[PDB]
Design a protein around this ligand. Structure first.
Ligand code: ZN
Lengths: 148, 8
């Protein structure tokens, strides 16, 4: 048994949000089915009709301090863009990574990222980075390389 | 695996 959670992209800001529930569905003749979404930590007034195929995906994963080795240049990640009036998760691509020795606080690595939507670039810590679930594959590979 | 709290 493996849990599968989802995140959906809002038409309001183009950011991704955790899905708490799928409330209903609607189908069109021209395609692209849509699903009514209740967002985690948001009321009913924020419910939204979401394009299922292009704006709903498997949930991005907040990184363990160990899992920094699964964040590589070229990757798509879900990155927390924190501003003065707004702080949202946006799709970004890793351009480079400065990997430094960990400490008691955990990961000390820095990642240069570029947000897909505004082309802005930012240096972020691992705590602001969410991995695409498929990168677990990499980790699994790494786990196979261990000693028995 | 808790995410940061998004602020719109
Ligand atoms: Zn690290």
């Amino acid at each position: 048994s493996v849990s599968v959670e989802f995140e959906a992209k809002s038409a309001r800001d183009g950011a991704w949000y955790d899905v708490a529930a799928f409330l209903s569905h609607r189908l069109f003749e021209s395609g692209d089915p849509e699903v009514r979404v209740r967002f985690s930590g948001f009321g009913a007034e924020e419910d939204e009709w979401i394009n299922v195929r292009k704006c709903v995906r498997q949930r991005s994963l907040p990184c363990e301090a160990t899992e920094c080795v699964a964040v590589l240049p070229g990757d798509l990640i879900l990155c927390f863009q924190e501003g003065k009036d707004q702080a949202l998760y946006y799709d970004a691509h890793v351009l480079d990574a400065q990997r430094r020795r960990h400490d008691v606080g955990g990961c000390r690595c820095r990642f240069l990222v570029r947000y897909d939507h505004d082309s802005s670039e930012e240096i972020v810590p691992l705590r602001k980075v969410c991995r695409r679930p498929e990168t677990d594959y990499r980790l699994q590979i790494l786990h196979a390389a261990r000693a028995a | 695996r808790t995410k940061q709290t998004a602020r719109k």
